[PDB]
Swiss-Prot record, chains A, B:
Pathway: Carbohydrate degradation; glycolysis; D-glyceraldehyde 3-phosphate from glycerone phosphate: step 1/1; Carbohydrate biosynthesis; gluconeogenesis. GO terms for biological process: canonical glycolysis; gluconeogenesis; glyceraldehyde-3-phosphate biosynthetic process; glycerol catabolic process; glycolytic process; methylglyoxal biosynthetic process. One of its GO terms (molecular function) is protein homodimerization activity. SUPFAM superfamilies: Triosephosphate isomerase (TIM). It is found in: Cytoplasm. This is Triosephosphate isomerase. It catalyses: dihydroxyacetone phosphate = methylglyoxal + phosphate; D-glyceraldehyde 3-phosphate = dihydroxyacetone phosphate. The active site is at H92, E162.
Length: 245, 245
């Protein structure tokens, strides 16, 4: 499995500061063995794709489930491809809990984006109350099933495990808690999809990854890379890309 | 009150099709007395702003209520200004009924967008069941109050009355039905805000406006322009702009 590092810029940046960041990435020495993707605000997707070196992919932070129509404020996979972006982040924790997107809706989005030829970073993760209650497993397996049910070809899918309690809080999961879930998710895939799918699908970790953290997390056997928020807007993003080196 | 015509492209287009549409608009003989604004998909705001004649304004179709943060998938007024767009469409029917955006949220977006210096086109309108139950007035005044209590400077606000039953259905409101609601809203403004605000605020109509029904609607005394959906993607949009000729 090729190590994968995605940067989710969330709702940050302007052309000046994003221009700066992109110039930094373009001139940096990034490991040839890492697949890098930058998820930019929709208003700057075109901008980002035009300025980033070709080896770095671009991802949209969200999309809707049909190519066109009466959906004021939404964008579709066809528009994302039009711009030259190759991926979309779906099921993000903020979409789920702040914007109320349901599992059913996320599933429809995944099916459509894949049908349209885009790669998908699909996010799953339990809340603090769920972890404390000890139902982390039931929660993620249920979210995964919603995604799986809509995946025909797993070759363009990356699963991102991001515990809600770890997102933007500074409370990173320990390497052992990340490994435990990744291992269980990989087993879910093996029993419910197939051995081949489980072996080739990248399962990445997200939730307060820093230049400081990454090396120990990246050494876990079932951790295939990371989905980075806050640190993707800093110079230390380079260190994260290079975690396995 | 300067006649105002806005095109709401909704989730439609690619650079090739929007490029042609724009070419047509830059070359058309548009009334010197109509203020025109085009509402483009966020992915295309930069493109649209670069291509359209400076005399035509560009509007985003939605935005969030803070300048930046951990809101995966959203865009802010600050980003919209960065690109050079000067308006935002807030409270559109599809955001209310498909995406669940509440009055409280819309009022917060309005206040933030105005604080950031953007012009706002705020949408209001009742459902068929509300109309038939005899509560159109109750529903539109409730929606307008949620917006108005969040407006410090009306100079940059445009109110758009778009009955839900008329959006994309072909069931245009008759001139008498539109005029009735516009007159009542202007009446609300006068008693809840001020006479000065009532006479200068444009109240535009939307919901199946076509090159064919526009002249009659535009002759109504309280109709100040339109918010066009489906027809804004067609050459007849030029005829709508020129509805008073």
């Amino acid at each position: 499995r090729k190590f994968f590092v995605g940067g989710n810029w969330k709702m940050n940046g302007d052309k000046k500061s994003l221009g700066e960041l992109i110039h930094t990435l373009n001139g940096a020495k990034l490991s040839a063995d890492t697949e890098v993707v930058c998820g930019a605000p929709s208003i700057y997707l075109d901008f980002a794709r035009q300025k980033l070196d070709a080896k770095i992919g671009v991802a949209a932070q969200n999309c809707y489930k049909v190519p066109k129509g009466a959906f004021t404020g939404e964008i579709s996979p066809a528009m994302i491809k039009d711009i030259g972006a190759a991926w979309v982040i779906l099921g993000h924790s903020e979409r789920r809990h702040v914007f109320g997107e349901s599992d059913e809706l996320i599933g429809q989005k995944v099916a459509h984006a894949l049908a349209e030829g885009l790669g998908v970073i699909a996010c799953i993760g339990e809340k603090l109350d769920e972890r404390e209650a000890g139902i982390t497993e039931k929660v993620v397996f249920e979210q995964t099933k919603a995604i799986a049910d809509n995946v025909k070809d797993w070759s363009k899918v990356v699963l991102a495990y991001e515990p809600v309690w770890a997102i933007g809080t500074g409370k990173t999961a320990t390497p052992q808690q990340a490994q435990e879930v990744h291992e269980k998710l990989r087993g879910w895939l093996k029993t419910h999809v197939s051995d081949a799918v489980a072996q080739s699908t990248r399962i990445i970790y997200g939730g307060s990854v820093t230049g400081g953290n990454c090396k120990e997390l990246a050494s876990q056997h079932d951790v295939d890379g990371f989905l980075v928020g806050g640190a993707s807007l800093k110079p230390e993003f380079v260190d994260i890309i290079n975690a396995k080196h």
